[PDB]
Amino acid sequence: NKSKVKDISLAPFGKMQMEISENEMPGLMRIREEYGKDQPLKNAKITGCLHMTVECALLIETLQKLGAQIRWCSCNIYSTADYAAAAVSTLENVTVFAWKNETLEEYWWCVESALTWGDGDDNGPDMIVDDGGDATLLVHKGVEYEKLYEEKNILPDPEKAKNEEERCFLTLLKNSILKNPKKWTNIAKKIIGVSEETTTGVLRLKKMDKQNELLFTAINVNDAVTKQKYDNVYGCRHSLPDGLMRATDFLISGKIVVICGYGDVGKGCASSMKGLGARVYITEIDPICAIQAVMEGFNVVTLDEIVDKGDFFITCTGNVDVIKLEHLLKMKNNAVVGNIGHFDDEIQVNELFNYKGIHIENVKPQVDRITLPNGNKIIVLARGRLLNLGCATGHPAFVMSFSFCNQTFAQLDLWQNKDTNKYENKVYLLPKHLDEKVALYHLKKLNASLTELDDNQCQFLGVNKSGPFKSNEYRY
Amino acid sequence: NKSKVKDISLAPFGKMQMEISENEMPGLMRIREEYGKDQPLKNAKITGCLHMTVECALLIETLQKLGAQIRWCSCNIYSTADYAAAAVSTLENVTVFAWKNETLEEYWWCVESALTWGDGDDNGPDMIVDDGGDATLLVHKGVEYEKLYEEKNILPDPEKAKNEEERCFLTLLKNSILKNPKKWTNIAKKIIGVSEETTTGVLRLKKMDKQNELLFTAINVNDAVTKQKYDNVYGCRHSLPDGLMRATDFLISGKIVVICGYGDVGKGCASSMKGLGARVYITEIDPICAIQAVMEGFNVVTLDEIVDKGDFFITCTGNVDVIKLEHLLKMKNNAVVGNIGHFDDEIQVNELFNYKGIHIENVKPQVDRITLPNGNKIIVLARGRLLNLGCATGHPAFVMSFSFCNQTFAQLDLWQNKDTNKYENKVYLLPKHLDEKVALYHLKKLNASLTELDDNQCQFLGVNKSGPFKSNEYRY
Amino acid sequence: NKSKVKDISLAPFGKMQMEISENEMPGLMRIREEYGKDQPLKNAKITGCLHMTVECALLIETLQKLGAQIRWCSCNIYSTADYAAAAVSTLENVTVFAWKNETLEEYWWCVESALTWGDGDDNGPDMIVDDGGDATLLVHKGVEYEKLYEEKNILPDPEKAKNEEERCFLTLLKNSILKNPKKWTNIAKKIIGVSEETTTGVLRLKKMDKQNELLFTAINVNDAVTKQKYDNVYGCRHSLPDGLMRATDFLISGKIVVICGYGDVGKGCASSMKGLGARVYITEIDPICAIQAVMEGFNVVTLDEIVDKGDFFITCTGNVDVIKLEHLLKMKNNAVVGNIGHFDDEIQVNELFNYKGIHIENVKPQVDRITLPNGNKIIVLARGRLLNLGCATGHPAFVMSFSFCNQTFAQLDLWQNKDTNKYENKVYLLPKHLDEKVALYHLKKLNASLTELDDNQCQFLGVNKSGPFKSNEYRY
Amino acid sequence: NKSKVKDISLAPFGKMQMEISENEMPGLMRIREEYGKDQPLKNAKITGCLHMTVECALLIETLQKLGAQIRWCSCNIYSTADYAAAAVSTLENVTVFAWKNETLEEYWWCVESALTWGDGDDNGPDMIVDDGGDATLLVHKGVEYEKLYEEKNILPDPEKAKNEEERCFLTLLKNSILKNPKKWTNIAKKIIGVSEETTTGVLRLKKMDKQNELLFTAINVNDAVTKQKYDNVYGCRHSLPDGLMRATDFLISGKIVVICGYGDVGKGCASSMKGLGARVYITEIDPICAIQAVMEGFNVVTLDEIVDKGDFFITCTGNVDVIKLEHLLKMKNNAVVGNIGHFDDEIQVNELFNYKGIHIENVKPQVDRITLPNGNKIIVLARGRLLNLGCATGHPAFVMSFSFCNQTFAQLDLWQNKDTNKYENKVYLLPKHLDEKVALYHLKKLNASLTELDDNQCQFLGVNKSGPFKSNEYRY
């Protein structure tokens, strides 16, 4: 029950950061004021697997101030802010397993430790807060392999590891089963539900739900309007250049920036690059998104067409093998490559790092310089992992306030309906009125005056004076 | 049946414009190349009620080249381009009833004439293309009043006219029933379906469908992605400043522009005003839209807060009484007021024009100068009706190509399934693949290179290499 | 001697436009309020040669309200607004010779008529307001050729006409000398001075002054901060897209726009195209301007590199042969070509129009469609002349207010120092304090609150609390 | 000959940064390739007083590679990058006295140490590179007080210290004179000249030159086009948000940002804030700049009008007392205040820090939180000193390349003309051709293709095919 952090003496620095960011998160603060003295999450055991940053610390503190017990780990080996981990590990009923620059082996250990609440009966959490689906994955795969072992006596061999991170994952599961072949099966049965924060995690849930593999309720927090339209757009508009500037200090204006993918994240990234004066190039597979990109003055092309002159290459597709080895080998000298989508699959950093005749030179934390066979030296950020969270501090508190408000409401609704049959083992979405509520909490801070709908106006539009004001199909 | 247009000698000028805009509508031209020699709409009787512009002429030509017969009218008394009406009235199997500056009495006469195909059995059309729902309204109200007369022997009295335009509407219906009390009831029975082009028309359809008043199938073309995301946004970004410039020639940069409503149209309008250097103020009733407005650098306020210093006031709410008489009376000298939403309800132009001590002075077509009681002189555009179509030429052909492609596909699908039970008396949406198809047709013209999804990438995303690439809930 | 205009019955329409634009020119209106009842220009004879637009009419009215007599003509054969010419010709002591679509022969006739005040002694004006230097040219060339005839008995032969417009010019001078070989020599002697409005006219004056050919004082109004920084930038940002929209109605967003020249005009043009969503490409010869263009996100290339995919080609160089015949022949179908710089030298429209196998088809006034040898049809605006003034109404009133305020001050200072030796036969610039004065007059209209410099702040900066606040070398 | 730096072990980290930034400074690298093996600065003793950053390290290395000996110090107590100082102190013939977070006493010690080359005859440098004029100040004041002491036997008393930093300055001078009352007088006599980098330093030089106090030649590097138009604009566009983000991590979009001053720096700052989506408010004393601000969509107001709702307050005036104590006391909770202009005079941080009832709490390096009397807690950056260099890393290498190229050329020209009478004790500027030269060096890196002027075009414009292309009065 002892937290594991880099250095507990950073707690005060983290505490100061939390106190300040409090004014930047009017949404979360409003939640504490309403459901505060009520303690609606009293006795609830919540395990979280989300970037251990300052904004995340304020989410933890909100959940615990709501009366819940928490075990937490980071969902990325570089996103953890040590001062935030130390500060949060100080709270009562909160245990944390996270630190910056953790190895892949240590990463899975933290996820497992966060999901394990002691031993024996009720060894798992009541609810899960995931960001990418790693905690959810471990549970589902654990249950899957435990059944395979109880039938064919077969264990997950890290031999068939199609990746280094997968090797540690399979190793963790193999050792887990050899210690207690029913651990995950018993835990999964007590889980009320999970709430997914990102597009990638939702994609995983949808595929499991499609094949009826979901063991418990899953709430799609990422598809909430006040999340995908704010977090994914305005957040990346902020943290992309921030991560690029801290990592390289290079000029962006007048430079050729290549953005792969023009969905929510791509739109946000491109907007900030355009405002700085960069020459934006977009790659896309979806014709609808491509036209949106062209209408903003961007040039839509295939990577092969611009890979030779590109100064910055940012992937925001949430797909795999977007920037292949053959592309990296053709880049100009001093080209910068980073991924802001998911894991490290978008860019074949591994293939490049293990290529014959490649020299890897570390410039600073999360920043490496690779010497290509032809002599060109390119820059790779966070070894292909989230550059905004690895080279910077991720989204600003004000943006994360929207996301964490939806997360909190997801946990509240899941816990308050645990004794009902409102939720099955499927993916659900938060109601429309909650989205408007979250938005309403941030209006004052923004000095935005909302107009009151009149009686005639209400009848004409066919809506209530309090909302919702749009239909469920509205795209905003 | 003979066409009724201003001057048929303008046909040549219109013909030249159509030939040129042909290159700007690759979408429509692609349709002619595929379903051309097939004549899928052969023997179909289509009645249209949409702005009679050059872009609309190319839509008519496409429908007739597909084998259909057409009767058409404009949906606005100022939007008709006489040279386009003359040109289209020239085509075989096409009859037109439209001209610029038509009176309200003449307007309804045109709608009725367009919907009436001869006399006796089968006196109505097979399908309807509407833009605002006026044709659809006439038919539904006609059936409603015809039943009221067949039961209580009561006729629609233009006495209870809550408006001048409504007076002519009720007068037209009263006369219609005194001539044939079953005209509309019999016509509504043969209508396969209608396809709505704008947000206002869809709102009308949704309300009727909510109360189960729909007499036939209705396709929501406005809610199609390649329409609400392109037409409503990029179209207005183009035609708002164009309408403002031609009507007043005033400088926009440095001026205080007040935009009411920040939905699709509002976002498009604000983007162009921002690009020109204006100081944009936004009014909103929806908190979610309000935050989007603030995140773009716009100040969100209530009209009462800025009505005194505003230089331009543009309504894009699609609501009623947004700019009341009390607001107009407080505006500065030379302030410009225009509506780009629906009809003339957004702004109380009528209340102002009939106010005691008000002097109305016509400056030029669709532009009037009003002298307020305090002596201030303000400028009102198109008497509160669509300023972009009244003072300019509406959206450009390239944008209308997306909308008209969805319209054509809507007519095609509706006609090809007339003998099936695919569509009931409800509001439907065109399939996802069609939206991507439409987008694909315009990529070449835009020099946009789409990327081909790989085999691994397809399985990972769980989509087909040809699309759709997004889920039905995707907001783009 | 009466005015010569297209149709005097348009006077009322023009009057209405002048009354409204009055609120858009707080600068000129302030001048009338200060030097109004004083009549400082009483008895002064002013000849003007500037675009006869509504904004220009308000300048004429201001000069006459100051007590001067005026004879005016347009400096371009397409820029005249007939309703403005009719309205201004109505004023007392104002004679106008201008109309839209005048032939080159008629053009010079108007210039000569405007410069000729009766007959005999004092046959010329006291001061001149030029825009391009045509009136100034005629006087200088007239004096030059009159001396050549009085010595070698040689006359200007229109045979050596290196251009059609030059032929009419030499023809006019030849006839002028065969009627009175001392007309211009005597007129030039009574001219107090001239004030140049545009960059091109200033270039002409500087070359004459360099070779000591100036016969009278010339004031460089164009190099005035509140002119080149406002008019050339913000004015073009407004009239470029307006001219393009009225002439073609084509979509600009997503289109490839090629701007040649990135000086004051180019910067303004590009800013508007960028705001609309176009993909901007810039051509430059000056490396300093080229970097400015790149830092704004624009791609700097040579015409040859983009002439194949360009949708719009706009020249703003003020140079000759920027877009040669070889370039025009390689343009895509439906490509638009227009000049916004000087005369019709920037684009080789003449070479193209007289090329073998070329078909010219008039679409509408100032808009022609040319069929290239390969079949491609391109659009040419105003036959290579100012597209913003030919296809639209030029800069808005508010922007012209700054230029015309500097013009009025130039005329006032020139007339008030006619009996002094403050000005020689050289090019002078208006003092710094006047530039700030002009700017100050427009602040209230813009709701801009200026800050008052404090006592300590004044000493520190070493400036007066009233200005100037910058040094003469400041670039703003 | 012993450098004084924080930790010499950071040398390798600094070296890696220098090697990378080399590719971002094609201008400086070109200088090394041309005047490299020539060693034009051989035996020259250069003392610099400029922000000891990585970009500065590359400038030092260039000067030494040119054959010069260097002694260097920082011109700000927070701008020094320790890893850069350590790396540069490694070079041969280079001595450095600088470190981050130095006290004011230590600051002047470094300046003095940098200007002192040994002892006895020739105890000073041959040339000086200044940024703010502190080194130049020390020398001029030193000579002034040395004469005052040699006449009235009066010493500079730190009693009359109108500031803490001035106290240390006068103390340094007093001790200097009590040790050798002719030190500075003798040194000033051997100084060939100095080259000023910033607007503030130039203002100081101009005031001395105006009163004939200049002891040696001064080159105004800041007024060079490729410096004020690139560095001051594009550099701040980059380092303003960067400093803001690293110091607070606060969201900028949708926030109210108040920029005081709209000159070169203000224009750059506002452009980046606008691109991020902030609501920009500008304060100005100059009417011309105010109109430029309004034409970009910004609201011009007096501080008193917005000081209550502002979220960020940035001063770019280069003036004194812009944000007084009475303004700071009225700011909202969590408001951020920072100066990017000169020293710490723009904002009365001192008055606030010494105000009764004020609590100062350090959040992190260069970031303090002040509790106001009414309880509001505001954030002050770098205690009123350059926030971009104190909270971040200043301008990016590519921008600094333009500035340092002009510096190098300034040193080269000054040293090559030391035995001539080309330069007097006045302020001079670099020739136009050099500005274009510097620009040309960076075109390739930017993928910008310059167009070659044609023979006819050259004669028409009256310029050489190689430039200059503009007149000295051109404002760009």
Ligand SMILES: NC(=O)c1ccc[n+]([C@@H]2O[C@H](COP(=O)([O-])OP(=O)(O)OC[C@H]3O[C@@H](n4cnc5c(N)ncnc54)[C@H](O)[C@@H]3O)[C@@H](O)[C@H]2O)c1
């Ligand atoms: N780092 C952060 O702070 C942050 C914040 C939110 C989301 N994310 C992550 O960002 C990624 C994308 O998120 P999103 O919400 O924008 O989802 P999205 O589905 O809206 O956007 C993905 C886009 O990529 C395009 N695409 C797919 N494969 C492509 C390929 N090979 N080449 C070019 N384009 C391709 C699609 O057409 C689509 O428009 C996910 O991995 C998500 O979880 C990161």
Ligand SMILES: NC(=O)c1ccc[n+]([C@@H]2O[C@H](COP(=O)([O-])OP(=O)(O)OC[C@H]3O[C@@H](n4cnc5c(N)ncnc54)[C@H](O)[C@@H]3O)[C@@H](O)[C@H]2O)c1
């Ligand atoms: N003239 C054109 O070319 C054109 C093109 C497309 C749509 N339109 C019309 O524009 C209108 C709006 O269209 P939209 O598609 O943007 O729909 P929308 O529903 O997406 O946008 C309307 C917005 O106005 C807001 N709103 C409603 N009442 C308001 C009030 N009283 N004050 C302030 N804001 C209010 C809503 O919250 C919403 O965000 C409709 O009338 C539609 O038919 C015109």
Ligand SMILES: NC(=O)c1ccc[n+]([C@@H]2O[C@H](COP(=O)([O-])OP(=O)(O)OC[C@H]3O[C@@H](n4cnc5c(N)ncnc54)[C@H](O)[C@@H]3O)[C@@H](O)[C@H]2O)c1
């Ligand atoms: N139509 C209008 O409303 C309006 C308003 C103001 C000025 N103008 C005219 O516009 C022209 C330019 O004006 P400006 O004030 O911007 O002057 P400018 O001197 O500031 O700009 C000219 C620019 O063109 C560039 N250039 C020259 N030849 C070139 C070539 N062959 N290719 C590419 N670039 C080239 C120069 O390097 C320079 O940057 C003049 O003709 C002027 O009279 C028209």
